[PDB]
Every structure is written in C-alpha cells, then in structure tokens.
Amino acid sequence: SGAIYVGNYRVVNRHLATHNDWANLVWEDSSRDLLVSSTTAQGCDTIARCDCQTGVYYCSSRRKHYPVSFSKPSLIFVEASEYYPARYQSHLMLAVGHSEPGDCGGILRCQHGVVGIVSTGGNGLVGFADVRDLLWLDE
Ligand SMILES: COc1cccc(NC(=O)N2CCC[C@H](C(N)=O)C2)c1
Numbered sequence: 501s502g503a504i505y506v507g508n509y510r511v512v513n514r515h516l517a518t519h520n521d522w523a524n525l526v527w528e529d530s531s532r533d534l535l536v537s538s539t540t541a542q543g544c545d546t547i548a549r550c551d552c553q554t555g556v557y558y559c560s561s562r563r564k565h566y567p568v569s570f571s572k573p574s575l576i577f578v579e580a581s582e583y584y585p586a587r588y589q590s591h592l593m594l595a596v597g598h599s600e601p602g603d604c605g606g607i608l609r610c611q612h613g614v615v616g617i618v619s620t621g622g623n624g625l626v627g628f629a630d631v632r633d634l635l636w637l638d639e
C-alpha cells in the first residue's frame with residue numbers, strides 16, 4: 501500500500517484504489533496502473549521533473565529503503581492477476597531489487613523528488629509506475 505499527495509491530488513495504484521478514490525476520480529489509466537483522486541487537504545510531495553535512472557525506494561516487506569538503478573519508462577509485459585488480464589503496462593521502470601505484492605504503493609525518489617510508485621515485481625525485479633511526465637500534478 502501507499503500513495504503520493506501533491507497539491508489537491510492523491511496518486512495511488514489503480515488496482516488498490518478505494519470507493520472514495522473512484523467517487524472523487526480526476527484521471528485513471530489501466531495501462532499504467534495509476535489512478536488520481538482529489539483531496540480536501542493539501543499535498544506537499546514534490547514530483548521530480550528529470551531523467552534520473554538512480555534513486556531509493558521504500559520496501560514495506562522489509563521495513564527498509566533500498567538504493568536502485570532503474571530502466572527508462574517503457575511498455576513491459578505483465579502476467580495476469582485478479583486485477584488485470586495479461587498485457588503490456590506502459591510508463592513502467594524496472595530495477596533489480598526485492599518486492600512482494602503488498603509492496604505496491606511504495607515511493608521511489610531521486611534527489612529531485614518523487615519519481616513513481618511500486619506497481620509490479622518478482623524474480624528479484626521491482627517495477628515502478630512513473631509519474632514524472634504528469635505535468636498537471638503541480639498546476
Ligand atoms: C510489487 O512486487 C510484486 C512482487 C510479486 C508479485 C507482484 N504482483 C504484481 O506484479 N502484480 C499483481 C497486482 C497488479 C500488478 C500490475 N501492475 O498489473 C501486477 C508484485
């Protein structure tokens with residue numbers, strides 16, 4: 501679990517969104533596993549606007565943060581789950597690191613701010629949904 505709070509927005513994995521997220525929907529994209537909902541309180545996360553390929557992510561299944569090198573956002577095949585059929589997930593970045601399903605929502609950050617959130621993994625890999633291209637999050 502986990503979310504990004506920036507201004508009047510809340511960014512979560514689309515597969516973990518709640519009834520309130522869907523009732524205050526701003527935008528959602530099944531192909532990216534992202535959903536943004538509006539909030540009544542103000543968000544203070546800084547979104548990174550960069551092309552960093554190194555950062556640190558929070559891994560809840562270890563209660564630890566890990567440094568990682570990650571790939572640039574791209575279309576990556578993802579196996580079927582109770583949430584989606586087998587498909588290509590866009591804007592996804594992979595890194596070699598530990599992750600378990602409950603780790604989804606953990607933030608990945610570089611020196612410029614929030615890069616994305618954990619969205620896929622397994623086999624010693626961790627995938628992050630990028631949010632750096634969503635320029636409307638700050639305006
Ligand atoms: C987050 O780390 C892991 C490790 C092992 C397994 C997993 N499960 C997943 O990757 N998925 C299941 C939930 C939906 C995800 C999606 N974006 O389509 C796919 C995650």
Ligand SMILES: [Zn+2]
Pocket residue numbers: 548549550551552610611612613
């Ligand atoms: Zn950066």
